[PDB]
Structure 1
Amino acid sequence: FQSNAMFAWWGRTVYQFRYIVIGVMVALCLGGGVYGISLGNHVTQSGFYDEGSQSVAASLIGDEVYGRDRTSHVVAILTPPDDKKVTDKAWQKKVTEELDQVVKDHEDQIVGWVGWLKAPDTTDPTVSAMKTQDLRHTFISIPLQGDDDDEILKNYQVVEPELQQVNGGDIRLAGLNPLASELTGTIGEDQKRAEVAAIPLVAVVLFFVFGTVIAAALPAIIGGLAIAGALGIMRLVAEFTPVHFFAQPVVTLIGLGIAIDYGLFIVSRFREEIAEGYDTEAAVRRTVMTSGRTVVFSAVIIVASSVPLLLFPQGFLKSITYAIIASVMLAAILSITVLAAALAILGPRVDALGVTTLLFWGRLVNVVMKRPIAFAAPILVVMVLLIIPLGQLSLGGISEKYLPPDNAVRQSQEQFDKLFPGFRTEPLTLVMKREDGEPITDAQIADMRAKALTVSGFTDPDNDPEKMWKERPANDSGSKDPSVRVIQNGLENRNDAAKKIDELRALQPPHGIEVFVGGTPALEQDSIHSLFDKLPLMALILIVTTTVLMFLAFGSVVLPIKAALMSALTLGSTMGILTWMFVDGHGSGLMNYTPQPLMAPMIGLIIAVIWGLSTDYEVFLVSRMVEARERGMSTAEAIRIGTATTGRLITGAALILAVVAGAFVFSDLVMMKYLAFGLLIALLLDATIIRMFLVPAVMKLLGDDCWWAPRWMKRVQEKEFNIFEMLRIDEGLRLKIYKDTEGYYTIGIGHLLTKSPSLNAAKSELDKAIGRNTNGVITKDEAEKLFNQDVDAAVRGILRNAKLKPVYDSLDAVRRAALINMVFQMGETGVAGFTNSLRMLQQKRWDEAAVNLAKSRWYNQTPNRAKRVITTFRTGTWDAYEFHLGGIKAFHHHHHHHHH
């Protein structure tokens, strides 16, 4: 159950109101770009955890009661100049005055600065550890004002340009906020790299697909408008829910490629239609009714592959899904609205500026036809070989290693952890809230301490079990509610956290006390647990929805399951290569990244994206061969028809997407490189190994079993437009005796009854013709009978005329119907007067024949019908009548009015 009257109406309307469409939509997209440029100041960095988890609740309660830990905010390593020591009093005074000046300039942003450098004369052992033994290095802590991570990072970015100058520039800034600033600036770095690299390369690839300036420029303008509008839409979404930083490059990584590919396909189809003889109006309408439907289906598939990411609670994945959906649907809309109207405005002008203005698949698919096993199993084994590294993939959180190993901030952090060990901690926290509301006594604290000392593997520095699990510090941003007490202690081995947490949560709390196990390891592990808990349902929804959409698009049952297994193998192989590249470290030396576990939500993101890519390409390809089997073509060449019709467009689209993805593989963010490399691997696997080799071979393996659909999941074959409806359009269908423009009695489709003025003589003739007492009224089927009689009489008259018989025997059924139309209108004597025109048609020179027919006085006197018939001659389709200028007014009886 499909619907194309909607697409036909829109193809008509976008040509009818093309200027309004182009103006309104371009204005909306440009205003959206102007409104969404400011998205960079409204994105967030949170959303990596499960915010409905116990670790997040523990973190929130600890923040409320004790205050958030601002000690890891800013760390500053200071080194005296000229091999001096940190004990030089003049240098001490200088640096201290500099730091005081920096803090009092930004009291709105900095809380203060805390170190050993502030109180050199002290005995506190922890403070005296902020200096190295050599007295060549000393680090300080600079807490910042703020209430959420984004405001704190903004305050740090406000204070950094002046804080960096301290100590003659020889101050090294590490901590949470410097790393955050670098990791977020990676996004803008990638944006600028894309602007510089992909735009001219995409221009070149387009200009090589279309040997024309305009036909190659249109998809680029479409992609630009799509990026602008999608950024505006994400800026609007930022008003309701937090949008993550990583959602910005997605718009440029995924949105731009699909938008330009949509534009490429639509412009190519418009050029096909124009080169097939249709004028601009019919070209736009058919371009819609075919390629726009394909594009909308593509967008629906991408949305169906993205939506399941809304199951995971990580707002990171949610904002990414929002960005994907917005970009893709806006690209589809622009492709069937700005681009359609722009083509309707330009016309054949889209080929005006050639190359000078700037200054075979069938053979290869037949190579796979002879021996399918020679390419199928030797490729399936290679893919299941690439799958085995996928098994040994690990997951982890965000560290300094997400930056390249030569990044100054990562090296500053690693030098801090070398010079000052024991300050960077990941302690697990037991948070105790008393449900009743009264203070917590030391007895309950001791009970919890003992029940925690039950568990092993926790750090015991000075070897005193009654000093482990010390109390969390408390600063001024905490309520200090006596009903909440937090103990905490680090882990000897981090890889045991997921177990120890599961132990610390099995401990029985004191009576009337609620226990929450939190901390950075607990946050990470609970996030990963939510991810793995919700993954199978996501995969099931993905596969089921995509397979149902393939049930809709294919009209088959074998092909959806086949393409599902194909996409599964492609996803597995791509993720195996990704594990081999980023976990096992292969390719790291050339790309300059550190091998490490992947970000957990990136696994679901990459699953969704790669599955959508594979399914989209498989659908767009296989539909073209289902087209041929619907026409009646044989299997072994229906495959060839589809593959050869898709080759150039598929390769160009894959090339543009590969350009845009390789523009991002050079990122300084290991997650960005992971995503872009996975996209590149999946894309180059689908554009070559999947489409060229495995698809035709594995399909031929099933031969004529691939299109088998049971019952009637398959659409019904349409009512084939015939000569009856054509001449009903041109001559009218009247079921009651009427007078023509000459004043004679006509009925049916231009069937002259008699040239007598008597209505009763005409009724006598009509009753004699039909065989009953009609009273001047006939049914539609009787009109069809009379019309078929007249058509047969005209055909017999044509085969009798020696000037019309050759060209009539030369033509096809549609052009033969056009010739019969001309006969019915103007007599065989009049039709034979088009000697050279009929010669052109007989020689199948449709363009010359149409141009010459449009110069008769037949066109001057009956221009609409003549234009319709001449279009039928030029194209050979009923398209000039399936969507025609409605409403005729003057009915005239035709020649060969058959009596009996």
Structure 2
Amino acid sequence: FQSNAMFAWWGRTVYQFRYIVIGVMVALCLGGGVYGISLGNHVTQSGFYDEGSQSVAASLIGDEVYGRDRTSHVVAILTPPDDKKVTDKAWQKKVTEELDQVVKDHEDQIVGWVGWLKAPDTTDPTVSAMKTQDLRHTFISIPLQGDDDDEILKNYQVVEPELQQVNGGDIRLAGLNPLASELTGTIGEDQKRAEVAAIPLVAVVLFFVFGTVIAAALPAIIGGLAIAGALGIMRLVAEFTPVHFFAQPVVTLIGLGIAIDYGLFIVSRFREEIAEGYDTEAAVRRTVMTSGRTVVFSAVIIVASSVPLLLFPQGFLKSITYAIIASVMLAAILSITVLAAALAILGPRVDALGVTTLLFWGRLVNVVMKRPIAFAAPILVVMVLLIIPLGQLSLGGISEKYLPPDNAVRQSQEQFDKLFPGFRTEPLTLVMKREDGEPITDAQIADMRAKALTVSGFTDPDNDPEKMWKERPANDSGSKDPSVRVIQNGLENRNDAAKKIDELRALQPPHGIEVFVGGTPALEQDSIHSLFDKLPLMALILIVTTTVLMFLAFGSVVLPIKAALMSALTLGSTMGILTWMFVDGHGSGLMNYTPQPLMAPMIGLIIAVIWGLSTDYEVFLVSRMVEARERGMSTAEAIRIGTATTGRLITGAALILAVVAGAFVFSDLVMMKYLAFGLLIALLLDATIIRMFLVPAVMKLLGDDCWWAPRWMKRVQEKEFNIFEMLRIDEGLRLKIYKDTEGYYTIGIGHLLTKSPSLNAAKSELDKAIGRNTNGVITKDEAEKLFNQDVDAAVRGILRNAKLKPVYDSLDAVRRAALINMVFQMGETGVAGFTNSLRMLQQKRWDEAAVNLAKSRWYNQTPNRAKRVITTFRTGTWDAYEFHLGGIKAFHHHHHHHHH
């Protein structure tokens, strides 16, 4: 079951209203583009955790009662100039005043500054540790105003320009916000690196696919309107849900490439249509009915590959999922609206301006025909090697190591940790809430502590177990509700976390108190637990729905099961090279990144994206080889017909995508590099090794078993348009006796009954011809009967004429019908008058014949029918009749009215 009546309708409709269409959509895309530049101000950095987990619950309760921890917001290492010691009172007074200035100039953003520098005469050991022992360094804590991560980062980025000039500029800022500003700032550099490098490179790859400026520029314009509109959509989405920072580059990395690839593939088909002889209107419609459906289905495939990501609770993956969907749907819509309308207006003009104005696959597939196992077996091995570095991979949260090793903020963090060890902590929290609502007594606190001391592995600095699990600090932002108490202690090994959290939760609460285990390790481990929990379901939904969509596309059970195996191998192989690059560390030196575990949600994203890419490239390649089977062409070069037809397009499309992805591999954010490289690898793999070799090999051997259609699973083949339906349009179909334009009694399809004025003489003839008493009325079947006889009579007359027989034998079945049509209309003697045009048709000079025929009096007297017939001669298809300007008003009986 399918509907191309929808696409045939739109293909016609979009040409008709091409001005309204191109005006409206551009207005929205540029409108949304203007609305969508404010997106950078409404994105979030939160969404990496499971907000339904126990650790998040512990965090919200903790921040409510005790106040959120603001001590790690801004850490600032101060160092005296000229080898001076930090004890220098003049330098102390100067810097203290500088710091007090920044705070009073920004009281809306800064809570204040805390450190040894504020009270140099102190005996508090921890405060005395805020200075190094050689007295060359000292750091301060600068807590900021704000009630969520985004508002706090905004407050930092406001005070940063002045905070940086403190102590003559020699102040090193670190902590959460200087790192967050740097991490989120990577998005901006990646956007501009794409503008500068990717766009000109794409323009070049485009002007090498088409040898023409206008033709090359259109897919680029589509890509621009896509991004603009998509950013507007996402900005609108941000009005309802939180949209993560990382959703912005996804719109560019994935959205831009596919939009241009869509535009490339559609403009490419439009020129093909024009070349084969179709006029602009028919060319547009045929493009939409074919390549347009390929684009829409491609969009469906990608969406079906991305929706399973919604199974994960992380807002990071959700907003990214929304971003992918918005981008691809808009790209698919724009490619068959704005682009189609543009071509409809331009027409053959798309090739006007040349390159100067600015200023073989089938042989190789045949080489892999001859020896499947020569290539295939030796590839299945090469890929499963790649799957064993995949086998070993680790997972971790965001750290300063996500930035390059030479990043100034990362190093300032790493210098802080070296100069001032023990300040940066990751304690696990035991959050206690009494349900009935009354205060928590010290006995229950001491009770929980004893149970906390049951579990080994928690830090004990000064070797005293009853000073462990100290109460969490309280500040002025906490409600200090007595029914909630929090105790905490760090782990001695962080790798123990997952086990210890399960142990801390395995503990049994004091009667009447609920215990939530929190802390940054707990937040991270719970998030990882969530992903591995729902990953099997996603993979199933992913594999099933794509395989189901391939059932619909191929018309086979074998091929989808085969294709899913191909995807799972490109996926496993790619993720293996990825693990080999970013965990095992190969390529880190050249690329300036630090080998480390991967971000966990990136794994779901990279599975969906790689799988979708693999599936999309397969469906396009294979369904054209299916076409050979539909045509009756044998398997062996069915496989070759499809590979060659697509060959130059796929490379051009993949190259364009590779160029876009290749610009993001230089990002300073390491999880961006992981994603971008994952594309390049899977893309080059799918566009070379998979496409060129593995697929043709494997398909041959299950040689004709590839296609298999249990029952009605396969589609029945449509009624083929015939000469009956053709002249039913040009001469009409009447089931009751009427008078034609000469007042002669006619019936069926222009079938002259008699030139007699007597209706009963006419009824006599009809009764004769049909074989029954008709009362002047026949069925549709009987009309086709009369018509067939008339056709036979005309063909006999044609084969009898010395001027018509040669060209008639020369012609294909469709063009033969075009000639019989002319014979019906004006008779053999009339048609034989087109001596040169007939010669041109006989020599298959379709273009010259079509042009010459339109210069006849035949064309001037009956343009609509002539244009139809002439078009049929030009293209050799029924296209001019399957969709047409309805309504013949003037009925005239044809020659060769055959009587029995």
Q: The TM-score by the shorter chain falls in which range?
A: over 0.9
Post-superposition shift, 1:630? 0.4
Q: TM-score scaled by structure 1?
A: 1.00
For 1:264 and 1:887, how far apart are their aligned partners in 2?
A: 37
For 1:826 and 1:645, how far apart are their aligned partners in 2?
A: 41
For 2:765 and 2:725, how far apart are their aligned partners in 1?
A: 25
For 1:766 and 1:353, how far apart are their aligned partners in 2?
A: 61
* Aligned residue in 2 for 1:277: 277
Q: Deviations over 1:138-190 (max 9, x none)?
A: 00000000000000000000000000000010000000000000000100000
Secondary structure of 1:712's counterpart equals helix
For 1:711 and 1:429, how far apart are their aligned partners in 2?
A: 62
For 1:284 and 1:512, how far apart are their aligned partners in 2?
A: 73
Secondary structure of 1:704's counterpart equals coil
Secondary structure of 1:168's counterpart equals helix
For 1:576 and 1:346, how far apart are their aligned partners in 2?
A: 48
For 1:202 and 1:790, how far apart are their aligned partners in 2?
A: 59
Post-superposition shift, 1:498? 0.1
Q: Deviations over 1:96-144 (max 9, x none)?
A: 0000000000000000000000000000000000000000000000000
For 2:111 and 2:735, how far apart are their aligned partners in 1?
A: 92
Secondary structure of 1:375's counterpart equals helix
Post-superposition shift, 1:669? 0.4
* Aligned residue in 1 for 2:673: 673
Q: Deviations over 1:751-801 (max 9, x none)?
A: 000000000000011101101000000000100000000000000000000
The structure 1 segments of at least 4 consecutive aligned residues displaced by more than 2 Å after TM superposition are: none
For 1:482 and 1:709, how far apart are their aligned partners in 2?
A: 71
Q: Deviations over 1:793-852 (max 9, x none)?
A: 000000000100000000000000000000000000000000000000000000000000
For 1:500 and 1:418, how far apart are their aligned partners in 2?
A: 27
Secondary structure of 2:713's counterpart equals coil
For 2:398 and 2:22, how far apart are their aligned partners in 1?
A: 45
For 1:112 and 1:216, how far apart are their aligned partners in 2?
A: 57
Post-superposition shift, 1:507? 0.3
Q: Deviations over 1:861-888 (max 9, x none)?
A: 0000000000000000000000011011
For 2:452 and 2:878, how far apart are their aligned partners in 1?
A: 83
* Aligned residue in 2 for 1:5: 5
For 1:663 and 1:618, how far apart are their aligned partners in 2?
A: 25
For 1:399 and 1:12, how far apart are their aligned partners in 2?
A: 55
Post-superposition shift, 1:712? 1.4
Post-superposition shift, 1:346? 0.1
Post-superposition shift, 1:627? 0.5
Secondary structure of 1:431's counterpart equals strand
* Aligned residue in 2 for 1:268: 268
Q: Deviations over 1:585-640 (max 9, x none)?
A: 00000000000000000000000000000000000000000011100011010000
Secondary structure of 1:791's counterpart equals helix
For 2:546 and 2:34, how far apart are their aligned partners in 1?
A: 36
Q: Deviations over 1:662-689 (max 9, x none)?
A: 0000000000000000000000000000
* Aligned residue in 2 for 1:19: 19
For 1:508 and 1:700, how far apart are their aligned partners in 2?
A: 63
For 1:124 and 1:172, how far apart are their aligned partners in 2?
A: 24
For 1:752 and 1:191, how far apart are their aligned partners in 2?
A: 73
Secondary structure of 1:885's counterpart equals coil
For 2:385 and 2:558, how far apart are their aligned partners in 1?
A: 25
Q: Deviations over 1:466-490 (max 9, x none)?
A: 0000000000000000000000000
Secondary structure of 1:467's counterpart equals coil
For 2:883 and 2:503, how far apart are their aligned partners in 1?
A: 72
Q: Deviations over 1:502-524 (max 9, x none)?
A: 00000000000000000000000
* Aligned residue in 2 for 1:243: 243
Q: Percent identity?
A: 100
For 2:358 and 2:198, how far apart are their aligned partners in 1?
A: 19
Secondary structure of 1:172's counterpart equals strand
Q: Deviations over 1:225-253 (max 9, x none)?
A: 00000000000000000000000000000
Secondary structure of 2:264's counterpart equals helix
Post-superposition shift, 1:715? 1.1
Task: Please show how residues 442-461 of structure 1 align to structure 2 within 5 Å.
Answer: 442-461=442-461
For 2:856 and 2:73, how far apart are their aligned partners in 1?
A: 86
Q: Deviations over 1:434-481 (max 9, x none)?
A: 000000000000000000000000000001110000000000000000
For 1:243 and 1:714, how far apart are their aligned partners in 2?
A: 43
* Aligned residue in 1 for 2:421: 421
For 2:341 and 2:715, how far apart are their aligned partners in 1?
A: 31
Post-superposition shift, 1:62? 0.3
For 2:502 and 2:554, how far apart are their aligned partners in 1?
A: 48
Q: Deviations over 1:298-350 (max 9, x none)?
A: 00000000000000000000000000000000000000000000000000000
For 1:216 and 1:710, how far apart are their aligned partners in 2?
A: 44
For 1:489 and 1:358, how far apart are their aligned partners in 2?
A: 69
Secondary structure of 1:800's counterpart equals coil
For 2:127 and 2:282, how far apart are their aligned partners in 1?
A: 81
For 1:899 and 1:400, how far apart are their aligned partners in 2?
A: 94
Q: Deviations over 1:272-292 (max 9, x none)?
A: 000000000000000000000
* Aligned residue in 1 for 2:742: 742
For 1:101 and 1:226, how far apart are their aligned partners in 2?
A: 47
For 1:7 and 1:716, how far apart are their aligned partners in 2?
A: 20
Q: Deviations over 1:178-228 (max 9, x none)?
A: 000000010000000000000000000000000000000000000000000
Post-superposition shift, 1:73? 0.3
* Aligned residue in 1 for 2:552: 552
Post-superposition shift, 1:650? 0.2
Post-superposition shift, 1:714? 1.1
Post-superposition shift, 1:701? 1.2
For 1:709 and 1:481, how far apart are their aligned partners in 2?
A: 69
Q: TM-score scaled by structure 2?
A: 1.00
Note if 1:517 corresponds to 2:517. yes
For 1:196 and 1:46, how far apart are their aligned partners in 2?
A: 30
For 1:420 and 1:41, how far apart are their aligned partners in 2?
A: 34
Secondary structure of 2:86's counterpart equals coil
* Aligned residue in 2 for 1:304: 304
For 2:465 and 2:157, how far apart are their aligned partners in 1?
A: 43
For 1:306 and 1:34, how far apart are their aligned partners in 2?
A: 27
For 2:360 and 2:895, how far apart are their aligned partners in 1?
A: 51
Post-superposition shift, 1:709? 1.6
Secondary structure of 1:76's counterpart equals strand
For 2:540 and 2:780, how far apart are their aligned partners in 1?
A: 53
Q: Deviations over 1:710-763 (max 9, x none)?
A: 111111100000000000000000000000000000000000000000000000
For 2:19 and 2:893, how far apart are their aligned partners in 1?
A: 41
Post-superposition shift, 1:708? 1.1
Secondary structure of 1:369's counterpart equals coil
For 1:355 and 1:466, how far apart are their aligned partners in 2?
A: 82
Secondary structure of 1:173's counterpart equals strand
Post-superposition shift, 1:363? 0.3
Q: CA RMSD in A?
A: 0.3
For 1:778 and 1:582, how far apart are their aligned partners in 2?
A: 79
* Aligned residue in 2 for 1:128: 128
Task: Please show how residues 436-475 of structure 1 align to structure 2 within 5 Å.
Answer: 436-475=436-475
For 1:130 and 1:100, how far apart are their aligned partners in 2?
A: 19
For 1:222 and 1:553, how far apart are their aligned partners in 2?
A: 27
Post-superposition shift, 1:14? 0.3
For 1:435 and 1:365, how far apart are their aligned partners in 2?
A: 72
Secondary structure of 1:432's counterpart equals strand
For 1:314 and 1:619, how far apart are their aligned partners in 2?
A: 31
Give unmatched runs, 5+ long, in structure 1. none
Post-superposition shift, 1:354? 0.4
Secondary structure of 2:517's counterpart equals strand
Secondary structure of 2:474's counterpart equals coil
For 1:248 and 1:443, how far apart are their aligned partners in 2?
A: 52
Aligned length: 900
For 1:897 and 1:391, how far apart are their aligned partners in 2?
A: 79
Post-superposition shift, 1:369? 0.3
Q: Deviations over 1:343-393 (max 9, x none)?
A: 000000000110101101000000000000000110000001111000110
For 1:680 and 1:712, how far apart are their aligned partners in 2?
A: 40
